[PDB]
Amino acid sequence: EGEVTELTPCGKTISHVIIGLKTAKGTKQLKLDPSIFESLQKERVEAGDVIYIEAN
């Protein structure tokens, strides 16, 4: 969970989506699949939005 700094998606489609997360305790980066990226696009997630995601 945390603030999303960037959204970087990388015969085209989407191979993976690079997503950063920034909190007062540190910053981490995750690469996600087009399914959960489709969930984010349905949630209208944009740069600067604090999101909560469970891995399981």
């Binding site: 007062a24 305790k25 540190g26 910053t27 981490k28």
Partner: protein
């Protein structure tokens, strides 16, 4: 050997004596007056008690600001060799001297150094023992413009309080009575309560609000990004291996860094911007004000460093300023 550190507001000479640069030959850390600079050098030698008319018998060191002008170095070198005629001369950096004094080993120096000066603030990383000029960051704001802006706000507070309090006295009262808060959001919340700081020499929250212009560029109206954006953009293009040492060693020197709480606020902000695994440690020397003169006195004290670093006037005239520049 005399160590000469020429700052925008203040100049410190030693082997001891620090004085104001107002005669101001150095504006935005770049000296704009060679005649006034040479006059301050001659007055510093007369105050140092040199035996000869012009300073000769001792090797001299001269601090060079970040991105110092090569034309100013050439004019000061020609006028210094033809006029002063010192037996030996060398160039040095106050941030490199203070970093060498702050490091436990004088051989190796690493980490991002943040130097807060009077007319400018320069933060540059250093690795392997040589400073990277690509990652160097300069800031036109400084403690002089911050003190002038504080005297302007306090001048607009009351009409009679402006003529009653001098600008320099308000700058010293802002040096002693003002500190940098760790949380700017908690500071304004603490100022609204019935219990107030109330520093009386009445000074309100503007004590902590005026020093906040260093970490907040938008407070003074400047268009600069900021220190957090400078650290993120500076550490983004660099490799991930040097980030551990850059966060492991952070040096803060200069008179503008004397504000209390700046080390804790810089440690909290740096630890917040850095990754959770990376450990951020800010290093503050016991004498950060004189750390530049101490490091310059040690670099001039080392025999091999004085032989290699020292450049003669006659050989420096034939080879040019590129010898000391490179």
């Amino acid at each position: 050997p005399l160590v000469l550190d020429n700052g925008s507001f203040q100049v410190r000479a030693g082997w001891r004596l620090q004085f104001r640069a107002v005669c101001s030959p150095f504006d935005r850390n770049v000296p704009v007056n060679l005649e006034l600079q040479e006059l301050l050098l001659d007055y510093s030698f007369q105050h140092l008690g040199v035996s000869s008319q012009g300073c000769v018998d001792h090797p001299i060191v001269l601090t060079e600001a970040v991105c110092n002008p090569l034309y100013s170095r050439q004019m000061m070198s020609e006028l210094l060799f033809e006029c002063y005629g010192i037996p030996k001369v060398a160039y040095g950096i106050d941030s490199l001297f203070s970093f060498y004094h702050n490091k436990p080993k004088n051989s190796m120096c690493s980490g991002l150094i943040i130097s807060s000066g009077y007319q400018c603030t320069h933060v540059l990383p250093i690795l392997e023992g040589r400073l990277d000029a690509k990652n160097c960051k300069r800031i036109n704001l400084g403690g002089s413009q911050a003190a002038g802006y504080l005297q302007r706000l306090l001048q607009l507070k009351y009409p009679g309080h402006l003529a009653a309090i001098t600008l320099s006295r308000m700058e010293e009262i802002l040096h002693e009575h003002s500190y940098i808060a760790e949380d700017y959001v908690e500071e304004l919340h603490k100022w609204r309560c019935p219990d107030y700081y109330e520093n009386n020499v009445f000074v309100g929250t503007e004590r902590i609000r005026a020093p906040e212009i260093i970490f907040q560029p938008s407070l003074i109206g400047e268009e600069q990004a900021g220190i957090a954006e400078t650290l993120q953009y500076i550490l983004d293009r660099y490799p991930k291996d040097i980030q551990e040492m850059l966060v492991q060693n952070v040096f803060l020197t200069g008179g503008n860094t004397m504000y209390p709480g700046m080390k804790a606020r810089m440690e909290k902000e740096l630890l917040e911007m850095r990754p959770f695994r990376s450990s951020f440690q800010v290093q503050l020397a016991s004498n950060p004000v004189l750390d530049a003169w101490y490091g310059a006195r040690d670099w001039a004290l080392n025999h091999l460093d004085d032989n290699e670093v020292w450049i003669t006037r006659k050989e420096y005239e034939e080879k040019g300023g590129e010898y000391l520049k490179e």
